[PDB]
Amino acid sequence: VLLKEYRVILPVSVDEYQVGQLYSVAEASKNETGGGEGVEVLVNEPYEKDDGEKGQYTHKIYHLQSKVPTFVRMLAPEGALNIHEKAWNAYPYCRTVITNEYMKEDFLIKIETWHKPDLGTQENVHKLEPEAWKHVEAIYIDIADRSQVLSKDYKAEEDPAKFKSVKTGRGPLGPNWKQELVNQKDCPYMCAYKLVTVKFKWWGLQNKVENFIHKQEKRLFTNFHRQLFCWLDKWVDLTMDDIRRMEEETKRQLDE
Amino acid sequence: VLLKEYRVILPVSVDEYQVGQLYSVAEASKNETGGGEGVEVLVNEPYEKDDGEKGQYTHKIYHLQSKVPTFVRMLAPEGALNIHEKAWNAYPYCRTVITNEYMKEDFLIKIETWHKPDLGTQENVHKLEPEAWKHVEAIYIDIADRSQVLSKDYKAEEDPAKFKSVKTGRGPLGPNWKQELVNQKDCPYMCAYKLVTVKFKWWGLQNKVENFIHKQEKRLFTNFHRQLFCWLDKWVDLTMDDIRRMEEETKRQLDE
């Protein structure tokens, strides 16, 4: 198991972030062929834990069987194409747990995030016991830094260093943007503290695989938040009510 | 590398088989979500080898990127979602070679098949050099034998032991069907000699993985041919001209 916390400072409010994030998941995924087909919802209900954490809990299986060719669709070991996702939505706290039926208890990706109106200055925001916290590498992702982007991933249109919002005037984000965020007129700020736990038990590969998955999550968080900012004009005016209407709307396209 | 030859005796003619096979690939796959989307054709042209083998050669990449969720679509190692398929169509001889960009030269599934008007009595129909032929396990698949089917795979409607063709009168196939095939009035026969070469280099798993893939191919060949027979009334009257028209027709639905 490998734990790291990715701290993503952003020139948006905690309230705006909830909307932008949900919008961006959709628009970044407009791409997908069978988008949301083959998704079985096992559970979807309110919850409250003994510790007071409360929100909406879902449990879903993404069945990948029909989205791959038969020759590959066969071949897979039993359960390898059934990915489970458990999610606890308690915004501004969120948790997701991804597992796979074939891997059983040998594989897990857990992401627990606090969205806070600060500049990433909180140490142990997830309140880990002191010994566990000592094993967590803290990593800051800077959405304006070109050196944090893989050349193959780069797109001028998704580069915060080049984008200025028509609706808000935010951006472009220059090298000292974070240092001027706090006192800058009209710019809100927040930090997503994404604590990521990766387990991939195997044999002579565990360390290499857990580190590789972490690198892929870092990459994803970097690209995703660069996009989220550059799509500011598309979502800034949307409310959560709009987001809900939109999902039910796509859900109705379950006319299949 | 592991080589085995699967000999599939069938109550159809070599000529009928070409049509049934192509039809069944489609109908068994009607299922798939994005069916034939994301398929890049690199090459498609006539060929002739120095040894006289001649036909049509294609080289395709099945890009799986957009058919899986972003969170999985990310995660994959570079090239893991690009599957190459090379096919040589020289019916009644056929060859397919499947590889993967991430695995590079460490993974291969090659299937070479002769379709012959006989009862599987030819030894070394693929003309392997004697030493290589000695390492090939020959395996007969009997489409009427319930014991060769996995319980989870079983379907009464795809069981040759229960099906009788309305258009031809063939079937149902009882325990001694193969022994009466030759002298039975109005029943044609053939055998598909499918020589399957599997390479999966890895470390402490090569033997286990190559044997597992072979088991999956055997399973696929068993299910597929049970289906092909039970779908006899759907395709027996189709010609290859019909098949061609049908593919171009689905191809035109590249209106995307």
Coordinates of C-alpha atoms in Angstrom, one line a residue, chain A residues 91-188:
Chain A
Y91 CA -19.3 17.6 -0.4
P92 CA -17.0 19.3 0.6
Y93 CA -15.8 15.8 1.7
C94 CA -15.8 13.0 -0.9
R95 CA -14.6 9.4 -1.0
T96 CA -14.4 6.9 -3.8
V97 CA -13.2 3.3 -3.7
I98 CA -12.4 1.4 -6.8
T99 CA -12.0 -2.4 -6.9
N100 CA -12.1 -5.3 -9.4
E101 CA -13.9 -8.7 -9.1
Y102 CA -10.9 -10.7 -10.4
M103 CA -8.4 -9.0 -8.2
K104 CA -10.6 -9.4 -5.1
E105 CA -8.9 -8.0 -2.1
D106 CA -5.5 -7.6 -3.8
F107 CA -6.4 -4.3 -5.6
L108 CA -7.7 -1.0 -4.4
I109 CA -7.7 2.7 -5.3
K110 CA -9.2 4.9 -2.6
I111 CA -9.4 8.6 -3.0
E112 CA -10.5 10.8 -0.1
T113 CA -10.7 14.5 -0.6
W114 CA -11.4 17.6 1.5
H115 CA -12.2 20.8 -0.5
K116 CA -11.2 23.8 1.6
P117 CA -11.2 27.6 1.2
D118 CA -7.4 27.9 1.8
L119 CA -4.0 27.7 0.1
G120 CA -3.1 24.1 0.9
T121 CA -1.6 25.1 4.3
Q122 CA -3.3 22.4 6.3
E123 CA -1.1 19.5 7.4
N124 CA -3.0 16.2 8.1
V125 CA -6.4 17.6 7.1
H126 CA -7.6 14.0 6.8
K127 CA -6.8 13.5 10.5
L128 CA -4.7 10.4 10.1
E129 CA -3.1 8.8 13.2
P130 CA 0.4 10.3 13.6
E131 CA 2.3 7.1 12.5
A132 CA 0.2 6.7 9.3
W133 CA 0.6 10.4 8.5
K134 CA 4.4 10.0 8.5
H135 CA 4.2 7.6 5.6
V136 CA 2.2 10.0 3.4
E137 CA 4.1 12.0 0.8
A138 CA 2.5 15.4 0.2
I139 CA 2.6 16.6 -3.4
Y140 CA 1.5 20.0 -4.7
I141 CA 0.1 20.1 -8.2
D142 CA 0.4 23.6 -10.0
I143 CA -2.1 23.8 -12.9
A144 CA -0.2 26.7 -14.4
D145 CA 3.2 25.0 -14.6
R146 CA 4.0 23.6 -18.1
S147 CA 6.8 21.4 -16.6
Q148 CA 4.2 19.3 -14.8
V149 CA 2.5 18.3 -18.0
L150 CA 3.6 15.5 -20.3
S151 CA 4.4 16.7 -23.8
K152 CA 2.0 14.2 -25.3
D153 CA -0.8 15.5 -23.0
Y154 CA -0.3 19.2 -23.8
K155 CA -3.0 21.3 -25.5
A156 CA -2.9 25.0 -25.9
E157 CA -6.6 25.2 -25.4
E158 CA -6.4 23.5 -22.0
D159 CA -3.4 25.6 -20.7
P160 CA -4.2 27.9 -17.7
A161 CA -1.1 29.9 -18.5
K162 CA -2.8 31.0 -21.7
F163 CA -6.5 31.2 -20.8
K164 CA -8.5 34.2 -19.6
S165 CA -12.1 33.8 -18.6
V166 CA -14.6 35.9 -20.5
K167 CA -17.2 35.7 -17.8
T168 CA -15.0 36.3 -14.8
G169 CA -11.8 37.8 -16.0
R170 CA -9.8 35.2 -14.1
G171 CA -6.4 34.1 -15.7
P172 CA -4.2 33.8 -17.4
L173 CA -2.2 32.2 -14.6
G174 CA 1.4 33.4 -14.6
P175 CA 4.4 32.0 -12.6
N176 CA 3.5 33.9 -9.4
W177 CA -0.3 33.4 -9.5
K178 CA -0.6 31.4 -6.2
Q179 CA 1.4 34.1 -4.3
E180 CA -1.0 36.8 -5.4
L181 CA -4.2 34.8 -5.1
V182 CA -5.0 35.8 -1.5
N183 CA -5.1 39.6 -2.0
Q184 CA -6.1 39.7 -5.6
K185 CA -9.4 41.6 -6.2
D186 CA -12.3 39.3 -7.1
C187 CA -10.4 36.0 -7.1
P188 CA -11.7 33.2 -4.9

